[PDB]
Amino acid sequence: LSNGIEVTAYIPGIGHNLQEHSVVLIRGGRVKDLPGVRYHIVRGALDTAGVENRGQSRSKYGTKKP
Amino acid sequence: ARYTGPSWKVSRRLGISLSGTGKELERRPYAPGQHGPTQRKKISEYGLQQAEKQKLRHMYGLTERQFKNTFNKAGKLQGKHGENFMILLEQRLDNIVYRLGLARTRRAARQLVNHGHITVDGKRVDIPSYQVSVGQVISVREKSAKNSAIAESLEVSSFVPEYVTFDAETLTGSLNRLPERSELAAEINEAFIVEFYSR
Amino acid sequence: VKIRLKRMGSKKKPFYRIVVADSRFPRDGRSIETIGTYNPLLDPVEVKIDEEATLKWMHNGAKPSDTVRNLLSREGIMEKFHNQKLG
RNA sequence: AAAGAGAGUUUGAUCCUGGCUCAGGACGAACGCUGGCGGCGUGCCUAAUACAUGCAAGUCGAACGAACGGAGGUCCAAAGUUAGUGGCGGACGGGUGAGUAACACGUGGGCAACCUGCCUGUAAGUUGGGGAUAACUCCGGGAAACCGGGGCUAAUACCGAAUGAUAGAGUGUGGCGCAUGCCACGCUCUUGAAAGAUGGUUUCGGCUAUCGCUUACAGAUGGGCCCGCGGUGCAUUAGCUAGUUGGUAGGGUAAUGGCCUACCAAGGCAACGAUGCAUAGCCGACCUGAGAGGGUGAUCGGCCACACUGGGACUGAGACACGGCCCAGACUCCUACGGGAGGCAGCAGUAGGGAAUCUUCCGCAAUGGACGAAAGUCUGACGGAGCAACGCCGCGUGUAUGAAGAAGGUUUUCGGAUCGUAAAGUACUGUUGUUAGAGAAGAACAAGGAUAAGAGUAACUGCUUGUCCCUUGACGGUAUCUAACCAGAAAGCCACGGCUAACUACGUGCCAGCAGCCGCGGUAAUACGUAGGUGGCAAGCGUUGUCCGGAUUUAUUGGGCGUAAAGCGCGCGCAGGCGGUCUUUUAAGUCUGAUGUGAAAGCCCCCGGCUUAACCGGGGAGGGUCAUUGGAAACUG
Ligand SMILES: [Mg+2]
Ligand SMILES: [Mg+2]
Ligand SMILES: [Mg+2]
Ligand SMILES: [Mg+2]
Ligand SMILES: [Mg+2]
Ligand SMILES: [Mg+2]
Ligand SMILES: [Mg+2]
Ligand SMILES: [Mg+2]
Ligand SMILES: [Mg+2]
Ligand SMILES: [Mg+2]
Ligand SMILES: [Mg+2]
Ligand SMILES: [Mg+2]
Ligand SMILES: [Mg+2]
Ligand SMILES: [Mg+2]
Ligand SMILES: [Mg+2]
Ligand SMILES: [Mg+2]
Ligand SMILES: [Mg+2]
Ligand SMILES: [Mg+2]
Ligand SMILES: [Mg+2]
Ligand SMILES: [Mg+2]
Ligand SMILES: [Mg+2]
Ligand SMILES: [Mg+2]
Ligand SMILES: [Mg+2]
Ligand SMILES: [Mg+2]
Ligand SMILES: [Mg+2]
Ligand SMILES: [Mg+2]
Ligand SMILES: [Mg+2]
Ligand SMILES: [Mg+2]
Ligand SMILES: [Mg+2]
Ligand SMILES: [Mg+2]
Ligand SMILES: [Mg+2]
Ligand SMILES: [Mg+2]
Ligand SMILES: [Mg+2]
Ligand SMILES: [Mg+2]
Ligand SMILES: [Mg+2]
Ligand SMILES: [Mg+2]
Ligand SMILES: [Mg+2]
Ligand SMILES: [Mg+2]
Ligand SMILES: [Mg+2]
Ligand SMILES: [Mg+2]
Ligand SMILES: [Mg+2]
Ligand SMILES: [Mg+2]
Ligand SMILES: [Mg+2]
Ligand SMILES: [Mg+2]
Ligand SMILES: [Mg+2]
Ligand SMILES: [Mg+2]
Ligand SMILES: [Mg+2]
Ligand SMILES: [Mg+2]
Ligand SMILES: [Mg+2]
Ligand SMILES: [Mg+2]
Ligand SMILES: [Mg+2]
Ligand SMILES: [Mg+2]
Ligand SMILES: [Mg+2]
Ligand SMILES: [Mg+2]
Ligand SMILES: [Mg+2]
Ligand SMILES: [Mg+2]
Ligand SMILES: [Mg+2]
Ligand SMILES: [Mg+2]
Ligand SMILES: [Mg+2]
Ligand SMILES: [Mg+2]
Ligand SMILES: [Mg+2]
Ligand SMILES: [Mg+2]
Ligand SMILES: [Mg+2]
Ligand SMILES: [Mg+2]
Ligand SMILES: [Mg+2]
Ligand SMILES: [Mg+2]
Ligand SMILES: [Mg+2]
Ligand SMILES: [Mg+2]
Ligand SMILES: [Mg+2]
Ligand SMILES: [Mg+2]
Ligand SMILES: [Mg+2]
Ligand SMILES: [Mg+2]
Ligand SMILES: [Mg+2]
Ligand SMILES: [Mg+2]
Ligand SMILES: [Mg+2]
Ligand SMILES: [Mg+2]
Ligand SMILES: [Mg+2]
Ligand SMILES: [Mg+2]
Ligand SMILES: [Mg+2]
Ligand SMILES: [Mg+2]
Ligand SMILES: [Mg+2]
Ligand SMILES: [Mg+2]
Ligand SMILES: [Mg+2]
Ligand SMILES: [Mg+2]
Ligand SMILES: [Mg+2]
Ligand SMILES: [Mg+2]
Ligand SMILES: [Mg+2]
Ligand SMILES: [Mg+2]
Ligand SMILES: [Mg+2]
């Protein structure tokens, strides 16, 4: 993070364009499935991309109106 | 207006024939969509309170935030809460125009008020939400004057409530005195909307 | 010490208070004792004033401003002050 | 008058206890999808990090230095409207919240222990002399900030004198208090003052008007000091302090005071939390809550502290002084290498940090400031315009009619249902919008000219009041209004098993994935993706972060301790808490009346003004274990 924190985040959506040494925007919210993951990733606010072929819940996953 | 969709749909879903006399419910009285002619389901207290809120909101044709603000301001008054809320809802300029015979529905009254075709004490008003008081008059300021729509509206307009006096020679109407819950809708249960806003 | 005019109200709609305060204080800040109101928007000016505390402050050395002087003249405080000085 | 909603989850099923999660409200908010307008507001919460560029505090010729027309000599030209020394202001106004756990702030008092320019009123006076100095001009050092020497000259610049203390001493009289002491008056001696400038009249001498200067006394204003009470975490922070504690003399300040000095004694504070560490500007107030309470100090108003870091003093009524001075420190810049200049936590603006915050705009027209007698100059205060759906309020994307039901999607038990009066048609309007025009308030003035009346005068001039004449707009052709055309140029987001409003089909098959919880996905998925439909809200809708509620989950209001967490293993006992019956007395607690105060703005009530609302204005009410004081004596003392 901006404070040098080792933070494990979760990637929502179907498919992603993420890799090492990439700028990501981390957002609040934990998932019970993974014992260590406590944060989510905003899709469409930074280097991270949106989700292709999304019609419903389009405000999240960062897809514009088709 | 706030909402320009079909009018029979909301009445059919709501169960009562608002802004009319059963003509929206003459056939298929079930709810719109592909479900409703098939079966139904149970109704809880929350459903009943929400139904009454929708009754009022789509009967008077005014948005939700303004509805809640009017409820809050009516709470400032003295007396029973729901009666005061309803009588303040009856003070709307749109309601007075519609019930006075100058129109036929809430939408027609709202549009005829927006364009300023009416006037109160010689003042053009474009605000449908204007709260009329005792002794305030209405007119047409000779804009529509010899208009077909207003003549047709005065033709088929049922009658006039006893709390408002109107003469058609000069198209003048004024509130006689404050209306009561006795001369009101009565298709609703005003005791549930206060509880719904109390949660 | 001046019997000053404080501005409030809204944008393009000013309203004024006839108030006494020190010349080193902010216009809308600290003051001593408000005495009147002044409304410019109406064509006939509506000015209400105590006319008794005003004379006391004038006696004690509270010099007004130009428009406050005009208002006191029209309402008769200045003429009565001159009469009191003579008498 | 006010007066409080619950649901899921431990089990094969129960009932309790208990935690976890959710349904609501609010942001100086941020991110995603989307986006029509108007009014009123808000916008570096992080780096008190570093700063290009421009502007933010100057003004007085009524105290001492201009071009033209133009006396005079076809040629040059005398007198008539414009730098600096000196006075006032720069201590106001404006910005930040670093530091500070303390008389910093709130509240209530005291100063018989104090100061105060300008403002107002009153009582007296503005009488006489001197020596200079800038400016200016020569000589030098000069890279440049600028330094020295010689000569010359003014003042409302500076310094003596005449006279004048309610200033110091000495005394007396009378009346008094809260201990020190206060007030009125009287006597003798010693000290302390001034400045003139613009006019009028007269004789010209004089006399006089306005603004000025010196002393004294009151008012008003702004400050200074002292005190009772009140508002945070840690005891896994127990002793701290030595000018400290008190006294005797002295110095110092406007004033009291170890504020400072010499001498004398060993004191002082602390389990009612001293000292120390950590965090933090304080309040009116804002959010929530049935209320008690809990959280916070955004905008605005009041107080306090700071101005690159640290220290100091001068001038001044007022500073230990944001855009003043000196020294040291870090950084930036110029240098001829000797040496010099600077401080945006002022208004705009740049770089960096951030998930995140605006134009290098107009005007002194209005209000208020500084200077002046006035015109007038300055005012990034302020009045306005620009940007950002950041928030509240308001309006629109049409209206009526139009069918066993246009056409086409979604399904079909493939007869049909559904979108749906929704369409086309039909009749109508222009709130918005386009085109063309009329177009306010905010303006009171100040000054200038006449007037009428007063005080003053020998008379004026002038002064105070009253009545008229003339002049002044950044916003801005702005709000607003008038006409013609147009359904045309204007709707999106989330959700649909239960909590919680709203279901069908297809695809996938413990994969893809969803998720606040119960948990869904292994071939018939109302929970995954899509399509149709439906529900909520609406130019907004969702997600996240922080606070309050639900949470009686710190229980005074309002919980408990046999077995669910919870009675020390027991005793003796200091401090503390509580205490049988009756009488008299006191008013510390208790209850009550009156006086003063608890600023404005904010919540609330009633009235109004904007076409309504938001918003704005007037009046009222609320809020304290508050100071003075008068009452009652049941209860606790
Ligand atoms: Mg979904
Ligand atoms: Mg003025
Ligand atoms: Mg009530
Ligand atoms: Mg739950
Ligand atoms: Mg609630
Ligand atoms: Mg946004
Ligand atoms: Mg968009
Ligand atoms: Mg708007
Ligand atoms: Mg800051
Ligand atoms: Mg000059
Ligand atoms: Mg200040
Ligand atoms: Mg602050
Ligand atoms: Mg001399
Ligand atoms: Mg001389
Ligand atoms: Mg000389
Ligand atoms: Mg003498
Ligand atoms: Mg004497
Ligand atoms: Mg006394
Ligand atoms: Mg004497
Ligand atoms: Mg002398
Ligand atoms: Mg003068
Ligand atoms: Mg002078
Ligand atoms: Mg408090
Ligand atoms: Mg607090
Ligand atoms: Mg002493
Ligand atoms: Mg701090
Ligand atoms: Mg608020
Ligand atoms: Mg509660
Ligand atoms: Mg706050
Ligand atoms: Mg701030
Ligand atoms: Mg403040
Ligand atoms: Mg600074
Ligand atoms: Mg700095
Ligand atoms: Mg001094
Ligand atoms: Mg300064
Ligand atoms: Mg500065
Ligand atoms: Mg700035
Ligand atoms: Mg930047
Ligand atoms: Mg100005
Ligand atoms: Mg002015
Ligand atoms: Mg300037
Ligand atoms: Mg400003
Ligand atoms: Mg401004
Ligand atoms: Mg913003
Ligand atoms: Mg908005
Ligand atoms: Mg709205
Ligand atoms: Mg459309
Ligand atoms: Mg249509
Ligand atoms: Mg139609
Ligand atoms: Mg088909
Ligand atoms: Mg239709
Ligand atoms: Mg045209
Ligand atoms: Mg024109
Ligand atoms: Mg035009
Ligand atoms: Mg005069
Ligand atoms: Mg006059
Ligand atoms: Mg006139
Ligand atoms: Mg004239
Ligand atoms: Mg003129
Ligand atoms: Mg002017
Ligand atoms: Mg212009
Ligand atoms: Mg223009
Ligand atoms: Mg216009
Ligand atoms: Mg046309
Ligand atoms: Mg056309
Ligand atoms: Mg059009
Ligand atoms: Mg048309
Ligand atoms: Mg249309
Ligand atoms: Mg749209
Ligand atoms: Mg689904
Ligand atoms: Mg859909
Ligand atoms: Mg919908
Ligand atoms: Mg609680
Ligand atoms: Mg318990
Ligand atoms: Mg027990
Ligand atoms: Mg146990
Ligand atoms: Mg035991
Ligand atoms: Mg035990
Ligand atoms: Mg024991
Ligand atoms: Mg004891
Ligand atoms: Mg007893
Ligand atoms: Mg108040
Ligand atoms: Mg305020
Ligand atoms: Mg009104
Ligand atoms: Mg208000
Ligand atoms: Mg008010
Ligand atoms: Mg008020
Ligand atoms: Mg009240
Ligand atoms: Mg007794």
PDB file of N, CA and C in Angstrom, chain B residues 96-97 100-103 112 117-122 136-155 157 164-174:
ATOM      1  N   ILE B  96     -56.520  21.054  -6.039  1.00  0.00           N
ATOM      2  CA  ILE B  96     -57.607  22.025  -6.131  1.00  0.00           C
ATOM      3  C   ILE B  96     -58.037  22.208  -7.579  1.00  0.00           C
ATOM      4  N   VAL B  97     -57.069  22.299  -8.495  1.00  0.00           N
ATOM      5  CA  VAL B  97     -57.397  22.461  -9.908  1.00  0.00           C
ATOM      6  C   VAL B  97     -58.166  21.250 -10.422  1.00  0.00           C
ATOM      7  N   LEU B 100     -61.662  20.975  -8.801  1.00  0.00           N
ATOM      8  CA  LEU B 100     -62.466  22.151  -9.089  1.00  0.00           C
ATOM      9  C   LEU B 100     -63.162  22.073 -10.443  1.00  0.00           C
ATOM     10  N   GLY B 101     -62.816  21.088 -11.271  1.00  0.00           N
ATOM     11  CA  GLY B 101     -63.447  20.894 -12.560  1.00  0.00           C
ATOM     12  C   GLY B 101     -62.653  21.395 -13.746  1.00  0.00           C
ATOM     13  N   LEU B 102     -61.537  22.089 -13.516  1.00  0.00           N
ATOM     14  CA  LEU B 102     -60.736  22.627 -14.606  1.00  0.00           C
ATOM     15  C   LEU B 102     -59.935  21.560 -15.342  1.00  0.00           C
ATOM     16  N   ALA B 103     -59.867  20.343 -14.812  1.00  0.00           N
ATOM     17  CA  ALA B 103     -59.154  19.250 -15.458  1.00  0.00           C
ATOM     18  C   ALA B 103     -59.895  17.952 -15.157  1.00  0.00           C
ATOM     19  N   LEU B 112     -51.380  21.863 -16.568  1.00  0.00           N
ATOM     20  CA  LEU B 112     -52.064  23.141 -16.718  1.00  0.00           C
ATOM     21  C   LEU B 112     -51.580  24.155 -15.687  1.00  0.00           C
ATOM     22  N   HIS B 117     -51.376  28.597 -16.812  1.00  0.00           N
ATOM     23  CA  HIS B 117     -52.691  28.923 -17.352  1.00  0.00           C
ATOM     24  C   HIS B 117     -53.658  29.401 -16.276  1.00  0.00           C
ATOM     25  N   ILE B 118     -53.362  29.148 -15.005  1.00  0.00           N
ATOM     26  CA  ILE B 118     -54.185  29.621 -13.904  1.00  0.00           C
ATOM     27  C   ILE B 118     -53.443  30.737 -13.175  1.00  0.00           C
ATOM     28  N   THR B 119     -54.144  31.373 -12.242  1.00  0.00           N
ATOM     29  CA  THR B 119     -53.574  32.448 -11.447  1.00  0.00           C
ATOM     30  C   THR B 119     -54.324  32.541 -10.126  1.00  0.00           C
ATOM     31  N   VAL B 120     -53.599  32.880  -9.064  1.00  0.00           N
ATOM     32  CA  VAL B 120     -54.178  33.082  -7.741  1.00  0.00           C
ATOM     33  C   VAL B 120     -53.998  34.547  -7.364  1.00  0.00           C
ATOM     34  N   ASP B 121     -55.117  35.228  -7.114  1.00  0.00           N
ATOM     35  CA  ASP B 121     -55.124  36.656  -6.789  1.00  0.00           C
ATOM     36  C   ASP B 121     -54.372  37.469  -7.840  1.00  0.00           C
ATOM     37  N   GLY B 122     -54.546  37.093  -9.105  1.00  0.00           N
ATOM     38  CA  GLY B 122     -53.901  37.804 -10.189  1.00  0.00           C
ATOM     39  C   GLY B 122     -52.412  37.577 -10.311  1.00  0.00           C
ATOM     40  N   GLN B 136     -58.295  32.180  -0.934  1.00  0.00           N
ATOM     41  CA  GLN B 136     -57.551  32.302  -2.179  1.00  0.00           C
ATOM     42  C   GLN B 136     -58.432  31.915  -3.359  1.00  0.00           C
ATOM     43  N   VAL B 137     -58.304  32.660  -4.453  1.00  0.00           N
ATOM     44  CA  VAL B 137     -59.128  32.455  -5.633  1.00  0.00           C
ATOM     45  C   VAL B 137     -58.271  31.863  -6.749  1.00  0.00           C
ATOM     46  N   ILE B 138     -58.942  31.382  -7.796  1.00  0.00           N
ATOM     47  CA  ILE B 138     -58.285  30.847  -8.980  1.00  0.00           C
ATOM     48  C   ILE B 138     -58.985  31.408 -10.210  1.00  0.00           C
ATOM     49  N   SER B 139     -58.277  31.391 -11.334  1.00  0.00           N
ATOM     50  CA  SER B 139     -58.799  31.937 -12.582  1.00  0.00           C
ATOM     51  C   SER B 139     -58.052  31.294 -13.746  1.00  0.00           C
ATOM     52  N   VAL B 140     -58.217  31.869 -14.935  1.00  0.00           N
ATOM     53  CA  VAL B 140     -57.584  31.356 -16.145  1.00  0.00           C
ATOM     54  C   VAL B 140     -56.753  32.411 -16.862  1.00  0.00           C
ATOM     55  N   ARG B 141     -56.734  33.653 -16.367  1.00  0.00           N
ATOM     56  CA  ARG B 141     -56.008  34.799 -16.921  1.00  0.00           C
ATOM     57  C   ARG B 141     -56.160  34.923 -18.435  1.00  0.00           C
ATOM     58  N   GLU B 142     -57.278  34.429 -18.972  1.00  0.00           N
ATOM     59  CA  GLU B 142     -57.622  34.566 -20.389  1.00  0.00           C
ATOM     60  C   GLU B 142     -56.546  33.991 -21.308  1.00  0.00           C
ATOM     61  N   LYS B 143     -55.758  33.035 -20.814  1.00  0.00           N
ATOM     62  CA  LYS B 143     -54.755  32.401 -21.664  1.00  0.00           C
ATOM     63  C   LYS B 143     -55.383  31.317 -22.531  1.00  0.00           C
ATOM     64  N   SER B 144     -55.926  30.274 -21.901  1.00  0.00           N
ATOM     65  CA  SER B 144     -56.712  29.298 -22.643  1.00  0.00           C
ATOM     66  C   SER B 144     -58.066  29.879 -23.028  1.00  0.00           C
ATOM     67  N   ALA B 145     -58.733  30.536 -22.075  1.00  0.00           N
ATOM     68  CA  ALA B 145     -59.983  31.253 -22.309  1.00  0.00           C
ATOM     69  C   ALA B 145     -61.023  30.381 -22.999  1.00  0.00           C
ATOM     70  N   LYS B 146     -61.129  30.517 -24.319  1.00  0.00           N
ATOM     71  CA  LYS B 146     -62.069  29.730 -25.117  1.00  0.00           C
ATOM     72  C   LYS B 146     -61.379  28.482 -25.673  1.00  0.00           C
ATOM     73  N   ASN B 147     -60.845  27.680 -24.758  1.00  0.00           N
ATOM     74  CA  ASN B 147     -60.099  26.481 -25.113  1.00  0.00           C
ATOM     75  C   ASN B 147     -61.004  25.257 -25.042  1.00  0.00           C
ATOM     76  N   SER B 148     -60.798  24.328 -25.977  1.00  0.00           N
ATOM     77  CA  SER B 148     -61.620  23.123 -26.022  1.00  0.00           C
ATOM     78  C   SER B 148     -61.360  22.221 -24.820  1.00  0.00           C
ATOM     79  N   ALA B 149     -60.096  22.095 -24.408  1.00  0.00           N
ATOM     80  CA  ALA B 149     -59.748  21.153 -23.347  1.00  0.00           C
ATOM     81  C   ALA B 149     -60.418  21.518 -22.029  1.00  0.00           C
ATOM     82  N   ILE B 150     -60.394  22.800 -21.660  1.00  0.00           N
ATOM     83  CA  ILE B 150     -60.994  23.207 -20.394  1.00  0.00           C
ATOM     84  C   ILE B 150     -62.512  23.067 -20.449  1.00  0.00           C
ATOM     85  N   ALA B 151     -63.120  23.368 -21.598  1.00  0.00           N
ATOM     86  CA  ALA B 151     -64.561  23.179 -21.734  1.00  0.00           C
ATOM     87  C   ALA B 151     -64.940  21.713 -21.568  1.00  0.00           C
ATOM     88  N   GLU B 152     -64.185  20.813 -22.205  1.00  0.00           N
ATOM     89  CA  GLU B 152     -64.443  19.386 -22.045  1.00  0.00           C
ATOM     90  C   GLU B 152     -64.249  18.949 -20.598  1.00  0.00           C
ATOM     91  N   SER B 153     -63.212  19.470 -19.937  1.00  0.00           N
ATOM     92  CA  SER B 153     -62.966  19.108 -18.544  1.00  0.00           C
ATOM     93  C   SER B 153     -64.113  19.553 -17.645  1.00  0.00           C
ATOM     94  N   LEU B 154     -64.617  20.773 -17.850  1.00  0.00           N
ATOM     95  CA  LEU B 154     -65.777  21.226 -17.089  1.00  0.00           C
ATOM     96  C   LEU B 154     -67.027  20.421 -17.419  1.00  0.00           C
ATOM     97  N   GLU B 155     -67.140  19.910 -18.648  1.00  0.00           N
ATOM     98  CA  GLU B 155     -68.286  19.069 -18.989  1.00  0.00           C
ATOM     99  C   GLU B 155     -68.310  17.803 -18.138  1.00  0.00           C
ATOM    100  N   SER B 157     -66.901  16.399 -15.247  1.00  0.00           N
ATOM    101  CA  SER B 157     -66.138  16.669 -14.035  1.00  0.00           C
ATOM    102  C   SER B 157     -66.872  16.231 -12.772  1.00  0.00           C
ATOM    103  N   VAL B 164     -65.150  23.429  -1.326  1.00  0.00           N
ATOM    104  CA  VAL B 164     -64.669  24.363  -2.336  1.00  0.00           C
ATOM    105  C   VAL B 164     -65.858  24.858  -3.150  1.00  0.00           C
ATOM    106  N   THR B 165     -65.891  26.164  -3.407  1.00  0.00           N
ATOM    107  CA  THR B 165     -66.965  26.804  -4.154  1.00  0.00           C
ATOM    108  C   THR B 165     -66.400  27.356  -5.453  1.00  0.00           C
ATOM    109  N   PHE B 166     -67.027  26.997  -6.571  1.00  0.00           N
ATOM    110  CA  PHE B 166     -66.539  27.379  -7.890  1.00  0.00           C
ATOM    111  C   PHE B 166     -67.706  27.782  -8.778  1.00  0.00           C
ATOM    112  N   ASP B 167     -67.538  28.889  -9.497  1.00  0.00           N
ATOM    113  CA  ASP B 167     -68.488  29.335 -10.505  1.00  0.00           C
ATOM    114  C   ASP B 167     -67.795  29.403 -11.858  1.00  0.00           C
ATOM    115  N   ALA B 168     -68.478  28.891 -12.884  1.00  0.00           N
ATOM    116  CA  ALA B 168     -67.900  28.723 -14.211  1.00  0.00           C
ATOM    117  C   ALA B 168     -68.084  29.929 -15.120  1.00  0.00           C
ATOM    118  N   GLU B 169     -68.828  30.952 -14.691  1.00  0.00           N
ATOM    119  CA  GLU B 169     -68.982  32.137 -15.529  1.00  0.00           C
ATOM    120  C   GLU B 169     -67.650  32.855 -15.716  1.00  0.00           C
ATOM    121  N   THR B 170     -66.839  32.926 -14.660  1.00  0.00           N
ATOM    122  CA  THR B 170     -65.501  33.499 -14.735  1.00  0.00           C
ATOM    123  C   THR B 170     -64.423  32.490 -14.363  1.00  0.00           C
ATOM    124  N   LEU B 171     -64.783  31.213 -14.213  1.00  0.00           N
ATOM    125  CA  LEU B 171     -63.847  30.153 -13.833  1.00  0.00           C
ATOM    126  C   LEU B 171     -63.126  30.497 -12.530  1.00  0.00           C
ATOM    127  N   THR B 172     -63.907  30.793 -11.495  1.00  0.00           N
ATOM    128  CA  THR B 172     -63.371  31.229 -10.213  1.00  0.00           C
ATOM    129  C   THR B 172     -63.685  30.194  -9.142  1.00  0.00           C
ATOM    130  N   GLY B 173     -62.665  29.778  -8.406  1.00  0.00           N
ATOM    131  CA  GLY B 173     -62.847  28.808  -7.343  1.00  0.00           C
ATOM    132  C   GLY B 173     -62.079  29.212  -6.104  1.00  0.00           C
ATOM    133  N   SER B 174     -62.649  28.875  -4.949  1.00  0.00           N
ATOM    134  CA  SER B 174     -62.048  29.231  -3.673  1.00  0.00           C
ATOM    135  C   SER B 174     -62.422  28.193  -2.626  1.00  0.00           C
TER     136      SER B 174
END
